[PDB]
Amino acid sequence: LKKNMVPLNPNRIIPDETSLFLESILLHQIIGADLSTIEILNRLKLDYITEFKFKNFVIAKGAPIGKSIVSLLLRCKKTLTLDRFIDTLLEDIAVLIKEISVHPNESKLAVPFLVALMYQIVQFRPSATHNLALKDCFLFICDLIRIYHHVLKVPIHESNMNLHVEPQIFQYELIDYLIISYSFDLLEGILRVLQSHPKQTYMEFFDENILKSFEFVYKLALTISYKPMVNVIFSAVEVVNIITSIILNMDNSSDLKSLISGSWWRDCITRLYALLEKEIKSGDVYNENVDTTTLHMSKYHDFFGLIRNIGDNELGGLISKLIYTDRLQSVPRVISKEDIGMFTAPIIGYKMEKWLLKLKDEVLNIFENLLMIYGDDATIVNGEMLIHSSKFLSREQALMIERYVGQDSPNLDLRCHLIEHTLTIIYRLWKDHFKQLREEQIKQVESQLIMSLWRFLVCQTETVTANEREMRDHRHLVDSLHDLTIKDQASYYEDAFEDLPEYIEEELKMQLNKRTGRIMQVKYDEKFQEMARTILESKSFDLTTLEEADSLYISMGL
Amino acid sequence: IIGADLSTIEILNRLKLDYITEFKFKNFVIAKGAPIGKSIVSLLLRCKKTLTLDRFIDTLLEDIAVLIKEISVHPNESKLAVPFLVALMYQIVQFRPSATHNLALKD
Amino acid sequence: ESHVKYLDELILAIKDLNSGVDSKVQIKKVPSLKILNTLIRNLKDQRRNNIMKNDTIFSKTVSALALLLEYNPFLLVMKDSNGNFEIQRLIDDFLNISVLNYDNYHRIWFMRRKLGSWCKACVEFYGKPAKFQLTAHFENTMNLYEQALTEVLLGKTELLKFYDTLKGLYILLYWFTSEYSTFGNSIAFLDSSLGFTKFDFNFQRLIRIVLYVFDSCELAALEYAEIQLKYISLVVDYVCNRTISTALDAPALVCCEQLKFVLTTMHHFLDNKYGLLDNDPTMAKGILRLYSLCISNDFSKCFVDHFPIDQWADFSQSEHFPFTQLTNKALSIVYFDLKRRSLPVEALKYDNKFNIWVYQSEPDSSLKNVTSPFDDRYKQLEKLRLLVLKKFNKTERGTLLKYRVNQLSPGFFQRAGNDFKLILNEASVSIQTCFKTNNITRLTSWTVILGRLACLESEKFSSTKDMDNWYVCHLCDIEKTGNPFVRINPNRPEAAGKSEIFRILHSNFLSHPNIDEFSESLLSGILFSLHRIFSHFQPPKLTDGNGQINKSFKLVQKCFMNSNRYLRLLSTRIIPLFNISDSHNSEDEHTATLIKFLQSQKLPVVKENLVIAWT
Ligand SMILES: [Zn+2]
């Protein structure tokens, strides 16, 4: 009688999740360092706080700090279940980072590793961490960054008499660069584990204090008059993405939007515009050049960080060479600043272009989100998303056609995805939000909007591709790198790319061909031709008059 | 152990061995100036994921036994790690006596 | 076999209702909806068992349906008025065919890519009222699967409902483990770039739930093991295609946490002996791919900490590792490579037979299955295994131009090679002799080689630089901010005087009597190559006085007013290169020649690049 049902296991080993979390803490190791993070904290003492104690987390004066961490970890494993073990660790390590930070003489070498350890604590089981702990940790990292006031506030240009006679030390600069970078990365991590909670509970996180603190630290990160650290710009726009993404995908959307003042947005969006109008040039990414025009990713902060692997991790060998590894000390091991930098490969510049192009995709992606938040007209969906986005579209087409075609870089495709993306940031702005596109602001970009749409409608002629035989001769010219990519994908990394059945590679000699069309700047996708057509041709606003329009159509044929 | 201020692993974190230039038996690498208890806790974390209990026991028994051995048979080297490794070995043995297979007890 | 002509006429019937001209998208609801009767006639002709298993008449069916939906983006948002648009009706119906084709990797990738075209490249037209009526539909139908997954704990579930529940969860997680290019910002949890999305934590939650189910259940059905290998296939596909995927190196990862999760998940999958099935390559593929991502890069410690392998060893048996001969073979290869890179250099020796480095073997054999050579023809496994064995050789590293000469003249570097004059003479004897008229592709490869080899000639008196360590140009490939024509040198060496490759180029391509018909592609290639030459060298004098446009500026006349826009805007990029010289342009006469040339285009379709050509 019903001999069908799947039988249970009578000895189900539910794994002790706090033990797995303990083991994930104990072998947490940042990428490039020689020792584990707990094994670095075993080699740190603190000789100005004579006795640290918050809630039975006693640290003696000459004692190793990681001894006290592992004593807390062993002592609170027996007692607490997982959601209490998490916020116990969060508040204890937060209080330790706090009184190491606010002190006049004491070195702060433990602080980066404690922040990275805190990040390992947060994102282990995001379903387990209760969000009041996330609120407390977010407020602590925001006022921790406003403690470190001076890392993101170095001036643009120094004195002419700034003599570089100096010990040229890098170790303290390396410490607080790690503090700022791991802090902003922890802000990103707190908000994605808050993003992963069920969608009825976001009001337990947000209040006025969250948004005012992030407003301050966001003005701090996306700087204007100081030298930009690009490591914090990635996370500081990813946080804004997480905010605008959860505003869309929650139910009580008003009590976030009522909690947000419009001044927060019109301070955010101007800095996003000023980020969007910067340039990405591989030959002087890593060079130090003129400010606020090239996203440059400085040589003196080039390491991975917590979430994403952003550089080549040139300063990861110096993280392990910051301590003496056979000694219990407080001051850092001395790193000379001018030894780094040795010249073999500009490929590092290409992948840093890849990250910066994803950054601009991120910025106009959150433009695309907060169009959909404020579908009705407001202070902020206000027509300058024609000006700045059309400037961006027109120039990233123009110097695409002038400079990038035939340059065999891997970053062509994504760079001709951005234009292909930002037309849509035009298009639904044009179609669904015309009521705020004011008559003067459209004439601020009448050149660039119409020229950018015209470089899509020029592709309806299409006497270029028209076959198969010579288009692959074009992709031997412009897109050999993606041929290498798809052969390494086909022979190694894709399940469906073997024993190809004469319909899966006819799809390849469809889609590589439309890809190399989209790279060659002739024959875009037909859908984007339609979206560019129904802005220029459609009669929502006289961009052109009918005797001025056919003056554009004669330069294709028509 | 009763009366000592530090834990036994926390004592072994404070011990190096500067005459065996590199200890290695079965991926239990100890450098020259490295803390010994670092290598014990690295073995403990590494063999927790892999082994079940009766294999974790005799893995620890033979590894700490080989370490006690080549600390012991040496002309110059101090033997300060040996009492704490023997006491740690005793903690390993008598935890679950039903779990320890008796060939490990023979060895 | 009889209904291939029906689809072949039906694609023409769909394309017949295009337009009167070549421009047709028609995004709005036209006042005429008869093709929806064909739409119903497509997907109802798809779920069947007899000859749907034929490859071509299924692929042409789904390509016909994608050509219907591509040229008609209004069909998705036609508001089939239950409560929603009919794209939600399309998702689950399209899911049923994919869940009926779970085992064939072609039939589900080729479906989900065109689903990506249907949601990314088609619901950009609609946005706010329609993005949130499909990004919630995926969340509802995924909430349904993870909800119905947990009642198999309490025992009151069925056995076939368990199967298609797991398979539907597999297909929903497989759609979202693609790259970012398949599903763009169409679905709201896949919105964030930078390899770090809302789906990541939700996905790791779902894989932990399905591992908890696999721990909770107890069943040794053979096809249950078959569908239980699919989750580790999915978790290795989750992390291998978030890679940055550079030129020819192993594709570096974006997030170390995803690698830790995938290694921990498949290690927990192996510990409980889940999914042991004979002659099945899936686990071996996952292990070899994840080790290939972690050969010697920054994640190698991350491989050895979270995927331990040294506790399954069992040297004393021909059954070396416990699982299955493919999985045991792949894991043995991984253990061989870890043990190789562990040992010092003085302990390793070269084979001279398999071209691999190897240690002092054993008192036993222990070396059979690592280089036996490899298995049944699972075509990716043996090249994975060759890469794992051959990345240690530290040979001449792969380079782009060395690839494109080895792709073109294979087996060239069995000689000196990095001597620069012999590759010029080999290119000379191939560029003068070995074509009658047939190389309408090979000569385009030759001119991209002649473009890239011009820079390598320019890097002497730039004496140290070499053929191997030239990845890209420092002037033509990377670029800096500012005025881009400041970087090129006024007193660079002349192209006719010193550069032998322009002698080659003018000897073949610019003195051939049929420049007016090569093809469009060879003209584009000769323009790129001449762009690189004149960006590294001074161009010759455009006019001596005897008429005499110098056989390359004549190509600028031939291409600048040409019919296609691509040759126009490609040939405009060398007009500024003629304007920069000394002892040819010091008293500004090439400038005057280009000025009185640019004043002579009253042709309308040349009005675009002319504005570029002035600027
Ligand atoms: Zn060049």
Side-chain angles (χ1 to χ4, degrees), chain A residues 2-79 81-241 243-257 259-341 343-424 426-558, chain B residues 1-50 52-107, chain C residues 3-4 6 10-11 13-14 17 20 23-27 29-36 38-40 42-52 54-318 320-345 347 349-361 363 365-367 369-378 380-389 392-393 398-540 542-615:
Chain A
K2 186 67 177 176
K3 57 178 73 175
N4 295 115
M5 295 182 182
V6 60
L8 280 72
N9 195 4
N11 57 4
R12 293 179 294 171
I13 304 299
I14 296 170
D16 195 1
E17 70 274 16
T18 186
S19 68
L20 296 176
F21 176 65
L22 182 66
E23 190 179 5
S24 67
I25 293 172
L26 265 295
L27 57 85
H28 179 76
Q29 184 175 2
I30 59 172
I31 302 299
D34 292 332
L35 302 177
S36 178
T37 300
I38 299 299
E39 295 293 328
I40 293 169
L41 292 174
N42 293 120
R43 263 75 148 213
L44 295 177
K45 68 182 181 181
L46 72 168
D47 55 354
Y48 292 99
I49 297 171
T50 184
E51 191 273 332
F52 181 75
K53 183 179 184 293
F54 179 72
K55 291 180 182 179
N56 65 14
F57 181 68
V58 177
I59 300 173
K61 183 175 173 65
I65 299 168
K67 180 182 183 293
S68 296
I69 283 94
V70 71
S71 177
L72 178 61
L73 289 170
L74 294 170
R75 187 176 63 245
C76 193
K77 182 181 183 294
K78 291 176 72 68
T79 67
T81 184
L82 182 60
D83 58 354
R84 294 179 65 190
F85 186 71
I86 291 171
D87 59 357
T88 300
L89 290 174
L90 291 177
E91 66 180 1
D92 290 331
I93 296 171
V95 172
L96 181 59
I97 294 168
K98 183 66 180 293
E99 281 94 11
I100 294 171
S101 297
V102 288
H103 192 277
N105 297 115
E106 183 176 359
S107 177
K108 284 90 170 64
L109 198 155
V111 178
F113 299 105
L114 290 171
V115 173
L117 187 64
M118 185 178 289
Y119 179 73
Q120 181 65 42
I121 291 168
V122 171
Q123 62 91 32
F124 182 73
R125 295 290 184 271
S127 66
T129 302
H130 189 275
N131 53 4
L132 292 175
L134 299 178
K135 184 177 180 179
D136 291 331
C137 184
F138 185 81
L139 291 174
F140 178 69
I141 298 302
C142 291
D143 63 358
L144 180 63
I145 298 168
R146 78 178 63 247
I147 292 168
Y148 291 96
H149 187 76
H150 65 281
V151 176
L152 298 174
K153 290 185 181 293
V154 293
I156 298 296
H157 59 86
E158 69 273 16
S159 177
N160 56 1
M161 295 303 294
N162 202 166
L163 294 171
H164 297 285
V165 288
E166 187 67 27
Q168 297 292 320
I169 53 91
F170 184 69
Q171 68 272 15
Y172 294 98
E173 293 181 355
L174 184 61
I175 288 171
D176 57 359
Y177 289 164
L178 288 172
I179 294 170
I180 292 296
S181 179
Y182 291 161
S183 297
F184 280 97
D185 289 331
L186 181 56
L187 296 176
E188 180 179 357
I190 295 298
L191 283 168
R192 194 170 298 284
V193 301
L194 187 275
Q195 186 178 4
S196 67
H197 284 90
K199 69 181 182 68
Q200 294 83 16
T201 60
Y202 293 107
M203 291 298 291
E204 295 178 354
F205 183 77
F206 293 100
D207 63 356
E208 184 68 27
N209 196 2
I210 298 299
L211 293 171
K212 295 295 288 184
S213 65
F214 179 70
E215 184 177 1
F216 181 76
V217 77
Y218 179 77
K219 289 183 172 67
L220 183 61
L222 276 73
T223 183
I224 296 170
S225 65
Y226 296 103
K227 289 177 70 67
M229 183 177 175
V230 182
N231 294 113
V232 311
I233 294 171
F234 288 108
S235 62
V237 70
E238 184 69 27
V239 170
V240 181
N241 195 6
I243 293 171
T244 62
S245 179
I246 63 172
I247 292 169
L248 292 175
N249 296 113
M250 66 175 70
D251 55 355
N252 192 1
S253 298
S254 179
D255 290 331
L256 264 293
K257 293 187 286 184
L259 185 63
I260 296 171
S261 65
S263 67
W264 185 72
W265 293 110
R266 67 182 182 271
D267 292 332
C268 181
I269 297 299
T270 62
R271 294 179 183 270
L272 292 171
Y273 288 159
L275 184 64
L276 186 62
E277 289 180 351
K278 293 182 182 180
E279 293 178 352
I280 298 169
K281 300 294 187 291
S282 177
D284 58 356
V285 173
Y286 292 99
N287 192 2
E288 297 295 327
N289 56 3
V290 63
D291 55 351
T292 64
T293 60
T294 60
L295 295 173
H296 65 280
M297 184 66 201
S298 177
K299 182 173 73 70
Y300 296 103
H301 53 84
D302 191 0
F303 58 90
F304 281 162
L306 295 174
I307 293 95
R308 64 183 63 87
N309 303 117
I310 199 68
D312 57 354
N313 198 5
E314 195 271 331
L315 298 177
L318 296 178
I319 300 169
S320 66
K321 292 189 286 185
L322 189 64
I323 61 170
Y324 291 98
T325 196
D326 59 357
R327 187 178 293 171
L328 185 64
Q329 74 276 17
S330 178
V331 297
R333 184 178 177 181
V334 172
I335 298 169
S336 179
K337 189 171 75 174
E338 57 91 21
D339 60 355
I340 58 172
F343 62 96
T344 56
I347 305 300
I348 300 168
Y350 287 169
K351 64 177 70 66
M352 191 63 209
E353 283 186 348
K354 184 71 179 295
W355 289 105
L356 295 174
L357 293 175
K358 292 181 182 179
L359 180 64
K360 288 185 178 180
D361 194 3
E362 188 72 28
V363 173
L364 62 92
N365 205 164
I366 69 174
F367 288 167
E368 181 178 359
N369 287 320
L370 66 93
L371 291 174
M372 296 174 67
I373 296 171
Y374 294 97
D376 55 354
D377 294 330
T379 302
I380 61 169
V381 179
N382 56 3
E384 284 85 5
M385 290 181 183
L386 288 177
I387 289 93
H388 294 88
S389 65
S390 64
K391 288 176 72 68
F392 180 74
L393 175 59
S394 65
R395 63 98 178 272
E396 294 291 328
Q397 288 178 353
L399 52 82
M400 176 68 74
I401 293 169
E402 292 182 354
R403 299 293 295 163
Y404 287 104
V405 176
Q407 195 178 3
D408 68 4
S409 295
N411 296 318
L412 297 176
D413 183 75
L414 183 59
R415 190 181 293 273
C416 62
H417 185 273
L418 294 177
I419 53 95
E420 187 178 1
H421 188 190
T422 187
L423 182 64
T424 63
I426 298 296
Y427 178 72
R428 192 176 66 249
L429 181 63
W430 184 259
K431 181 174 72 68
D432 291 334
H433 293 86
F434 183 75
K435 276 74 68 178
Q436 189 63 41
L437 301 178
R438 292 178 66 189
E439 191 270 332
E440 180 66 27
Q441 292 176 355
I442 298 170
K443 288 184 178 180
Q444 293 180 357
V445 286
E446 185 178 1
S447 176
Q448 299 176 357
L449 180 61
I450 296 173
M451 186 65 201
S452 65
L453 297 174
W454 183 73
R455 293 184 187 272
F456 291 107
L457 274 73
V458 69
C459 295
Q460 68 182 357
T461 60
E462 194 268 327
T463 184
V464 176
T465 64
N467 64 9
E468 60 89 19
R469 178 74 271 175
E470 66 183 2
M471 294 183 73
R472 70 184 69 188
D473 294 333
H474 294 90
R475 74 190 179 187
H476 292 293
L477 294 170
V478 300
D479 190 70
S480 65
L481 275 299
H482 185 270
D483 288 330
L484 290 173
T485 295
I486 196 164
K487 289 187 263 75
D488 291 331
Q489 183 179 2
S491 64
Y492 296 100
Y493 294 108
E494 180 65 29
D495 295 332
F497 289 167
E498 65 181 0
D499 292 331
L500 284 76
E502 188 62 27
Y503 66 95
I504 205 68
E505 72 273 20
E506 294 292 328
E507 192 275 336
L508 294 176
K509 64 179 71 66
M510 187 274 287
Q511 69 91 26
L512 278 78
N513 288 113
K514 69 179 178 66
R515 182 178 175 88
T516 187
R518 192 266 306 278
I519 294 169
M520 283 169 66
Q521 298 295 318
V522 61
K523 182 69 175 178
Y524 290 104
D525 194 358
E526 294 291 327
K527 278 76 70 179
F528 297 97
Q529 294 181 358
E530 183 69 26
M531 284 182 281
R533 184 180 295 113
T534 58
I535 300 169
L536 189 149
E537 185 178 2
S538 180
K539 277 75 178 175
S540 178
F541 182 78
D542 51 355
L543 284 74
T544 62
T545 64
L546 73 160
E547 69 273 15
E548 291 173 353
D550 55 355
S551 177
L552 295 172
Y553 290 107
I554 52 91
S555 63
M556 288 83 78
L558 274 297
Chain B
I1 59 172
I2 302 300
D5 293 332
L6 302 177
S7 178
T8 301
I9 299 299
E10 295 293 328
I11 292 169
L12 291 174
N13 293 120
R14 263 76 147 213
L15 295 177
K16 68 182 181 181
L17 72 168
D18 55 354
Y19 292 98
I20 297 171
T21 184
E22 191 273 332
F23 181 75
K24 183 179 184 294
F25 179 72
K26 291 180 182 179
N27 65 14
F28 181 68
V29 177
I30 300 172
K32 183 175 173 65
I36 299 168
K38 180 182 183 293
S39 296
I40 283 94
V41 71
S42 177
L43 178 62
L44 289 170
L45 294 170
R46 187 176 63 245
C47 193
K48 182 181 183 294
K49 291 176 72 68
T50 67
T52 184
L53 181 60
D54 58 354
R55 294 179 65 190
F56 186 71
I57 291 171
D58 59 357
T59 300
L60 290 174
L61 291 177
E62 66 180 0
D63 290 331
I64 296 171
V66 172
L67 181 59
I68 294 168
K69 183 66 180 293
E70 281 94 11
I71 295 171
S72 297
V73 288
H74 192 277
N76 297 115
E77 183 176 359
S78 177
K79 284 90 170 64
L80 199 155
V82 178
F84 299 105
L85 289 171
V86 173
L88 187 64
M89 185 178 289
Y90 179 73
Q91 181 65 42
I92 291 168
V93 171
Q94 62 91 32
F95 182 73
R96 295 290 184 271
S98 66
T100 302
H101 189 275
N102 53 4
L103 292 175
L105 299 177
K106 184 177 180 179
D107 291 331
Chain C
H3 290 173
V4 57
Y6 183 78
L10 195 275
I11 52 96
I14 289 176
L17 295 173
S23 68
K24 70 286 186 187
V25 173
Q26 295 180 356
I27 59 169
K29 296 297 289 182
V30 293
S32 296
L33 279 77
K34 64 182 288 185
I35 51 95
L36 188 142
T38 71
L39 174 65
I40 297 171
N42 292 117
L43 80 165
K44 286 187 178 292
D45 284 332
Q46 191 176 3
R47 61 265 180 92
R48 194 165 52 82
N49 53 1
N50 196 2
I51 49 95
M52 286 293 106
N54 193 1
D55 291 331
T56 63
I57 62 174
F58 177 77
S59 179
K60 287 175 69 176
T61 301
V62 62
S63 295
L65 196 275
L67 195 148
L68 178 60
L69 268 304
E70 179 176 358
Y71 293 158
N72 291 313
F74 66 98
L75 291 175
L76 295 170
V77 195
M78 63 86 67
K79 186 66 177 176
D80 185 74
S81 178
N82 297 115
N84 52 359
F85 302 119
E86 77 98 22
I87 187 167
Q88 299 185 3
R89 185 260 183 189
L90 192 274
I91 289 301
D92 52 355
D93 287 332
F94 190 76
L95 176 65
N96 291 122
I97 289 97
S98 62
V99 78
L100 287 172
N101 293 116
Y102 64 95
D103 52 351
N104 193 359
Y105 291 108
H106 301 86
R107 292 181 184 270
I108 38 92
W109 183 71
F110 186 67
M111 281 177 68
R112 69 104 174 267
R113 183 165 183 169
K114 293 188 288 185
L115 197 277
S117 70
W118 295 340
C119 64
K120 177 180 88 274
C122 293
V123 197
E124 286 169 350
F125 297 104
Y126 298 96
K128 177 66 181 294
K131 176 176 173 179
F132 291 157
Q133 297 190 2
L134 88 157
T135 193
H137 180 270
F138 285 114
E139 288 182 352
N140 291 124
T141 192
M142 187 173 70
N143 192 6
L144 189 147
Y145 285 165
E146 68 95 17
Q147 189 274 132
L149 187 63
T150 61
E151 283 94 14
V152 314
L153 274 68
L154 50 86
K156 301 301 291 293
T157 191
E158 288 84 4
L159 187 269
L160 273 302
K161 184 174 172 63
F162 183 78
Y163 288 160
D164 59 356
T165 299
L166 264 71
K167 291 174 186 176
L169 182 64
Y170 169 72
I171 299 297
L172 262 75
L173 294 173
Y174 178 72
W175 289 352
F176 297 149
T177 50
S178 177
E179 69 272 14
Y180 182 73
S181 299
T182 298
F183 291 164
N185 296 321
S186 63
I187 307 168
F189 48 82
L190 293 174
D191 54 355
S192 179
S193 295
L194 302 164
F196 191 59
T197 67
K198 192 171 84 70
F199 182 71
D200 289 334
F201 285 160
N202 196 2
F203 171 72
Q204 293 175 0
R205 183 178 63 84
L206 293 180
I207 298 300
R208 290 184 183 98
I209 287 175
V210 75
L211 287 179
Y212 182 76
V213 168
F214 293 161
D215 293 335
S216 296
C217 69
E218 192 270 330
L219 181 58
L222 186 60
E223 57 89 26
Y224 173 72
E226 179 69 29
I227 71 166
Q228 199 175 8
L229 268 300
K230 293 195 297 179
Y231 283 90
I232 54 94
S233 177
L234 180 138
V235 81
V236 70
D237 288 332
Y238 169 72
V239 74
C240 71
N241 61 9
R242 265 75 172 181
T243 57
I244 53 97
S245 181
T246 184
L248 54 89
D249 195 75
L253 278 79
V254 290
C255 182
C256 182
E257 191 268 331
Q258 293 176 357
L259 181 65
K260 289 183 175 68
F261 177 74
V262 177
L263 289 175
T264 304
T265 295
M266 76 180 190
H267 187 267
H268 179 270
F269 185 80
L270 290 181
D271 282 334
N272 292 317
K273 302 291 182 67
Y274 288 162
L276 272 70
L277 197 143
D278 197 0
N279 63 24
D280 184 74
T282 302
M283 191 70 209
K285 291 178 78 69
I287 293 163
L288 285 171
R289 285 170 179 175
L290 285 172
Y291 181 66
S292 69
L293 297 177
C294 298
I295 294 294
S296 179
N297 50 1
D298 290 328
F299 299 99
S300 295
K301 292 178 96 289
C302 183
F303 182 74
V304 74
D305 293 329
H306 295 282
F307 192 75
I309 201 169
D310 205 5
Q311 289 82 11
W312 285 335
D314 192 73
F315 281 156
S316 298
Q317 293 180 357
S318 296
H320 194 194
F321 285 172
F323 296 96
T324 51
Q325 196 276 124
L326 295 175
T327 304
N328 300 327
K329 189 169 184 179
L331 289 167
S332 177
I333 291 165
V334 172
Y335 182 71
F336 176 71
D337 200 359
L338 288 175
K339 192 174 180 180
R340 183 176 66 238
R341 289 193 176 95
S342 67
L343 288 175
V345 181
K349 63 101 174 180
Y350 186 69
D351 194 7
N352 299 113
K353 182 176 181 179
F354 292 106
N355 295 112
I356 57 99
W357 292 87
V358 66
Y359 57 88
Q360 295 302 110
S361 301
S365 176
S366 71
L367 265 292
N369 51 2
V370 63
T371 173
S372 55
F374 305 106
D375 52 352
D376 189 6
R377 300 280 79 81
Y378 297 104
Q380 293 177 354
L381 270 299
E382 68 272 15
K383 197 177 265 79
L384 285 170
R385 290 163 178 179
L386 258 298
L387 186 138
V388 171
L389 291 175
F392 188 75
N393 291 321
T399 315
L400 188 60
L401 83 166
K402 290 174 71 175
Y403 181 77
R404 287 178 293 182
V405 299
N406 289 320
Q407 185 66 41
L408 184 55
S409 71
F412 182 74
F413 292 95
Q414 57 94 32
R415 61 186 66 188
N418 55 3
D419 184 75
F420 183 72
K421 187 256 192 294
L422 52 84
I423 180 62
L424 263 64
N425 288 112
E426 181 68 28
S428 177
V429 70
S430 66
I431 211 67
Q432 291 175 356
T433 62
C434 70
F435 67 101
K436 301 298 291 294
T437 184
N438 293 316
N439 297 124
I440 52 95
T441 66
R442 187 179 296 274
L443 288 176
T444 62
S445 65
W446 282 115
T447 188
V448 73
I449 290 299
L450 292 172
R452 269 66 172 171
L453 263 292
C455 172
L456 188 58
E457 189 177 4
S458 72
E459 287 182 353
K460 61 102 175 180
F461 58 98
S462 65
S463 65
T464 308
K465 273 73 67 179
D466 201 74
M467 184 72 198
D468 52 357
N469 52 1
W470 186 74
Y471 294 92
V472 289
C473 174
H474 66 89
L475 190 276
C476 302
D477 289 331
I478 65 170
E479 68 175 5
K480 298 181 177 69
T481 190
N483 189 4
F485 298 102
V486 174
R487 295 178 67 196
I488 54 176
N489 196 8
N491 53 4
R492 65 190 182 277
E494 296 179 354
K498 293 183 184 294
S499 73
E500 292 291 327
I501 195 159
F502 181 66
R503 189 265 306 162
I504 295 170
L505 204 75
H506 181 74
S507 297
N508 201 178
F509 294 97
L510 301 177
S511 297
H512 190 274
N514 288 319
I515 297 170
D516 50 357
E517 56 268 14
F518 291 116
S519 180
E520 293 176 351
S521 67
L522 182 53
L523 287 176
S524 65
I526 194 63
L527 283 175
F528 284 123
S529 65
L530 188 140
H531 180 273
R532 289 181 184 270
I533 293 173
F534 288 163
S535 66
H536 288 284
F537 294 99
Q538 285 184 355
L542 267 61
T543 296
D544 60 355
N546 292 318
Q548 192 264 330
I549 47 175
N550 53 3
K551 298 296 186 292
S552 67
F553 185 60
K554 189 261 186 295
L555 185 60
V556 184
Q557 273 96 31
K558 187 59 68 178
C559 296
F560 185 77
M561 62 177 287
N562 200 353
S563 67
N564 52 1
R565 68 184 297 273
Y566 182 71
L567 293 177
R568 286 201 299 270
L569 55 86
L570 213 167
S571 64
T572 190
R573 294 174 63 191
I574 58 180
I575 289 172
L577 295 173
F578 292 148
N579 201 8
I580 171 65
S581 176
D582 53 349
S583 295
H584 288 88
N585 212 168
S586 179
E587 61 98 20
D588 296 330
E589 73 275 22
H590 280 92
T591 303
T593 302
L594 268 304
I595 285 169
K596 65 180 179 289
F597 174 67
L598 291 176
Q599 295 173 0
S600 65
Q601 287 81 16
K602 300 295 182 181
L603 208 153
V605 78
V606 199
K607 284 174 181 291
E608 178 181 359
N609 59 346
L610 176 61
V611 177
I612 298 172
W614 284 106
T615 299

